[PDB]
């Protein structure tokens, strides 16, 4: 395996590049091509050989190899080049791959997280079963912590809570569930998704009685 | 244009056979070298194979004692076969178009002009004992007054579900869970909402 850096970061328009370091025996003796892959989508090669460029490829991307280590510069960052990157070669008788390059981009304002908490249905509660859910939306950085409270008193009993994600805004998401019975629902008066976001808590709250 | 599809069961029980096939349009095997790899969830890619314009096929030497990869030129597909799985075979597998018949070395890499040039879009395959189970959906609205809607997919298997939707959670109960800010859609369970 090819050793990347965990993550590289810059802020917009800045000169970032990320390393591959092999051997002789791989990035030494054979041609580097590089990999870009933004989450949850799939795969596109941005860079092949030493700094050939696929047709579509902006020339913001380079490649360069000095002795067993290959580079992928961004020459100017961009939103849109915030993905993981992956350097790809050969060895004696396998492919090899690197390890992988998350390339965050950093110096962003802060948003507040948009939370419309949900109840239920009537369909839930007569198959006698409560779902609360807890949409998070638009924050920096991704680091929220919700915790659900039922008349004012921690809850942690089936709690399940997506980590940061991020759509297309160079934002950050998450989603929290609350998966108790009917009469959990109905016995307390008001549930409560209090979620926190660097000092900043912005509880929202459904009761029962609608 | 030249176009990948994977296809097959994204559900396997342990220790049965993954398998799976790469249809190809757009461009003929007999010009092209087709390569699998797989991604494990959060992790890097992995070599399955090769399989050049010349019938000759390559093996991940780690996984050949599991491994089968065969060539259709007629039928424009790229099959692969991996017996005795575990969860650690569960990944998104991806078949992928090589710029030339033959690299100088594995999964298009090695000389001048050689690199892949079309991506299949991947198939998420799971190796669980976990029943296939199509999701219950409800609405999602919040009529309890205020002074001013989402979908409810819930309890199904497996990933992954398409419908700003949010990355699905995974309950106790062993089952995902996701909703959106409707039309859902499960291709593993065959049913649309």
């Known amino acids: 395996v090819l050793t990347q850096p965990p993550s590289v970061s810059g802020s917009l328009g800045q000169r970032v590049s990320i390393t591959c370091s092999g051997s002789?025996?791989?990035?030494?003796?054979?041609?580097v091509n590089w990999y870009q892959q933004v989450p949850g989508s799939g795969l596109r090669t941005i860079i092949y050989?030493?700094?050939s460029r696929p047709s579509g490829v902006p020339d913001r991307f380079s490649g360069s190899k000095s002795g067993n280590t290959a580079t992928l510069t961004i020459s100017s960052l961009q939103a849109e080049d915030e993905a993981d990157y992956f350097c790809?070669?050969?060895?004696?008788?396998?492919?090899?791959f690197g390890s992988g390059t998350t390339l965050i981009v950093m110096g962003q304002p802060k948003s507040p997280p948009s939370v419309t908490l949900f109840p239920p249905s009537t369909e839930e509660l007569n198959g006698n079963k409560a779902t609360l859910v807890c949409l998070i939306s638009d924050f920096y950085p991704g680091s929220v912590t919700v915790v659900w409270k039922a008349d004012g008193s921690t809850i942690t009993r089936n709690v399940e809570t997506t980590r940061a994600s991020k759509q297309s805004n160079s934002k950050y998401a998450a989603s929290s569930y609350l998966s108790l019975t009917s009469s959990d629902w109905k016995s307390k008066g008001s549930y409560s998704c209090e979620v926190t976001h660097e000092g900043s808590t912005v509880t929202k709250t459904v009761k029962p009685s609608e | 244009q030249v176009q990948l599809q994977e296809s097959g069961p994204s559900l396997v029980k342990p220790s049965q056979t993954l398998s799976l096939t790469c249809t190809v349009s757009?461009?003929?095997?007999?010009?092209?070298?087709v390569s699998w790899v797989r991604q494990a969830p959060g992790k890097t890619l992995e070599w399955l194979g090769d399989?050049?314009?010349?019938?000759?096929?390559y093996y991940n030497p780690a996984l050949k004692s599991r491994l089968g990869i065969t060539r259709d030129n007629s039928k424009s597909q790229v099959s692969l076969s991996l017996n005795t799985i575990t969860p650690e075979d569960t990944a998104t597998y991806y078949c992928?178009?090589?710029?030339?018949?033959?690299?100088?070395?594995?999964?298009?890499?090695?000389?001048?002009?050689?690199?892949?040039?079309?991506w299949g879009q991947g198939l998420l395959v799971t190796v669980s004992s976990a029943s296939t189970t199509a999701p219950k959906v409800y609405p999602l609205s919040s009529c309890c007054g205020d002074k001013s809607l989402g979908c409810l997919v819930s309890s199904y298997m497996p990933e992954p579900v398409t419908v700003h939707t949010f990355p699905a959670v995974l309950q106790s109960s062993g089952l995902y869970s996701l909703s959106s800010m409707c039309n859902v859609a499960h291709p593993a369970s065959s049913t649309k909402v």
């Open positions: 992928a178009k090589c710029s030339v018949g033959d690299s100088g070395s594995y999964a298009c890499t090695g000389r001048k002009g050689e690199y892949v040039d079309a």
């Open positions: 757009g461009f003929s095997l007999s010009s092209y070298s």
């Open positions: 399989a050049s314009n010349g019938g000759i096929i």
């Open positions: 002789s025996s791989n990035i030494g003796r054979w041609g």
């Open positions: 050989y030493e700094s």
């Open positions: 790809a070669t050969g060895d004696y008788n396998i492919a090899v």
